[PDB]
Design a protein around this nucleic acid. Sequence first.
RNA 1: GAACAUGGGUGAUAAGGUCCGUGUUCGAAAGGGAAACAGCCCAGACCACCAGCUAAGGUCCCAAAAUAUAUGUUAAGUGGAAAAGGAUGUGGCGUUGCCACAACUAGAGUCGAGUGACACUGCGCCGAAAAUGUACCGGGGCUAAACAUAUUACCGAAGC
RNA 2: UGGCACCUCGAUGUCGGCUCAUCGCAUCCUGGGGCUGUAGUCGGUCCCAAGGGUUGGGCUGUUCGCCCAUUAAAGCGGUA
Lengths: 136, 145, 93, 37, 174, 82
Amino acid sequence: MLLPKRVKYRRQHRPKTTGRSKGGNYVTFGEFGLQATTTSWITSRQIESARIAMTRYMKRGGKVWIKIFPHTPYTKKPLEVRMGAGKGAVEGWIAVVKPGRILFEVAGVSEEVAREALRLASHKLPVKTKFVKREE
Amino acid sequence: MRQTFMANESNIERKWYVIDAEGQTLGRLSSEVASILRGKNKVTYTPHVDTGDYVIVINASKIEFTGNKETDKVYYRHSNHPGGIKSITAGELRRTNPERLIENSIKGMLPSTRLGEKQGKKLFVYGGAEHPHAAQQPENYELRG
Amino acid sequence: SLKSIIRQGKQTRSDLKQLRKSGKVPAVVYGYGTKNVSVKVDEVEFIKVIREVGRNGVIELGVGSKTIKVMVADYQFDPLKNQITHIDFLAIN
Amino acid sequence: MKVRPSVKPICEKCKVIKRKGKVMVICENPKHKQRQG
Amino acid sequence: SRVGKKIIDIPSDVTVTFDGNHVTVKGPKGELSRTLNERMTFKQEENTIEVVRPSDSKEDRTNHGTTRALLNNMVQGVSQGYVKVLELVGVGYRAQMQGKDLILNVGYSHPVEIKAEENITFSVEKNTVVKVEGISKEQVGALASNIRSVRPPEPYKGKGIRYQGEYVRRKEGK
Amino acid sequence: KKGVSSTKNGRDSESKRLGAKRADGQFVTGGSILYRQRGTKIYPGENVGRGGDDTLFAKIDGVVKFERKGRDKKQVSVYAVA
RNA sequence: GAACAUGGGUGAUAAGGUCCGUGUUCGAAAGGGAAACAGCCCAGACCACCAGCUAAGGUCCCAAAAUAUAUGUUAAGUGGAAAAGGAUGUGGCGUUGCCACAACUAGAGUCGAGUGACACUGCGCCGAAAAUGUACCGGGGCUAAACAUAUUACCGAAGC
RNA sequence: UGGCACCUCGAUGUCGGCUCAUCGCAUCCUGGGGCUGUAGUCGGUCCCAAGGGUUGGGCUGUUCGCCCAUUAAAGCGGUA
């Protein structure tokens, strides 16, 4: 649950989802990057239900480096009521990804682990992924 | 209004033809028979009178079909009764009463009018036995476009 | 590295994406004596840049005249394909 | 047998071949065996 | 593609003559059988039929390995003639013959009878077991298999009648 | 069906119609309005004057001219030409 | 006031939902195509005619016109209805490398002829369960009478 | 359980039970199976299978629900 602390406004607009990526199209903190190939809203809960799990495969082995942080906090109403008497209280945090962006970064550990670990991790996210080998 | 020859009774003459379905593919040999039955091969064809001739088959047990339609393409039929769906015959109904197989196929490409029903009564299909219409002097059509 | 390109054509309609599956890339030399007088290169002779320079050094050009050492500097890597578009050189003077 | 969409060659003894509609697997043990579902 | 030029002999007690889409093995080893082998361009020049029909069709490389083998199994099993043994696991199979009708038993209140066909010889050196012969494994095979599967042998404790030898999944419980 | 928890919002004010009111290069009258805005986005130049901390108006007839002043500040002007 | 196509808010990147903005049609518009279908595509009826050329869409039969020509792609009736995935499916695009790889085996020697990960693909396959009766090609039926291109010929409105 | 307000306010008039049905499969019984932590009787999960079956009572109005005694079994649904 990667969330912030101090926010000026608590109710915001749904982010725009069209077009290619902007920044973070490469990998730094480790040899190996997991790219993204479609568009969606990753929603902090995926991240910590696809981080603890990747480390439970990693058995507290090597180290990871996350390349996605949810900023715009999405809101939602509780029980199904009438339409329109205000906005629902914030209940989530979302991050938007576009095709061509490295989401995770790791170092040192063997490529067998890299493949058989990011395949474990992608099985939680609603975006379709593809391996990247730091292919200079 | 002007000058347009209109064929009528006691002015048109019908003949008799004999086609053989030895190496035909049903559908292809059915569309060429429907046109002859409707009489759309004459220069004096009118759509308000019965123009055309009769057709006779002598090999309805030699018809073949490409693909896996011999095991599929089942024929359904209802009897207006709660759960009267009848699909006993499938694609291998060419061994038992194959005359109906071709009959229906050629009767499924004709108009459903009062004149389109009497035009479908000028076709005689036989499983494999020779026709007994030797007093009509039927011409051998065989060859199809 | 002896790699040769040629002067390609401008006034391009964007109908080139489809003449692009068949290999090419743009390329434009910087430096005096000439200008941004672009050159067109192909890829599967760059399937062997592996041994050519590394990334920092010399390449022949054979670009008609003024065939000297020219340096491909920038990077215009492309997402979603493992393709490449507009890699470009410069003169050494 | 088992039945799930994600058949593969499962253990280090089971290997696959395409049947009519099933891309099921043949090997030496009936604890790793599957047909598409 | 699989087995292309594997042009092997036809040294027979027989010959092969091709007119139709097939073969026919007349030999003192086995007299005059064949199915329709292949609608492929079949030759038989001086002793054998190894005819280079199929190539460049995905169907062709299984057609080769199938129809060179329709001819192949036919000519051989009708020349060679080779059926192997079967097993006797337990106490009290009553193995015999009555022409083309053998007998066993499994532990049924009523030994149910099975009868077979000819052109697959009914061969019995069998007192609690099975070991038969014939000519064409296509015709001795499905019967070497109806006899396999009468009382599927105890996959726990031994009883049954089966084939020449393997392991069975041997199971344990309370 | 259930009396909702209402909205602590709903208030706004009437728009004032700010911006340019005469186009560059057209002929005017003495005393006409040229621009209306809060604070001095466009300074007054030649033969124009600022009113009560807005409304840059013209002082003589002629044609208007929009122009840059220093590096990043503009200005308006009127020239007597006829 | 309504639908359709775009640019946003609100709701659950729910609704043939709801509120604004820019266009067109319906409203107040007949005629041809989408099997039937105010809002989708083509096109605006002053009246007569048993004249001719075209538009969208089409040319085996119902039912006007090619069972046209040249080239590929597809074995499911795909065409003629969904997704994450899954894989000894594949025609095209690059590899990589033994001159062994199918029967060798460590959990070593041969003989004779193709093997594969990976990368972009194009078309397929499985994933795919509902209540009166086949039951979304409109029906008969089709391996081209399907799909992707090219060039042609002709048919087609109350348009000219 | 809800959300929307498109047909009906010069009327589309009623929840259980009784009487009589008909269709489905996501199978309660019977049937054909591979697999079991299936020796056998038994039984657990899965696959195919829709022809016919699928009980009488006590207790609040109960569409629910608990209990008594049986039975090869006392399945879940759609059809204003």
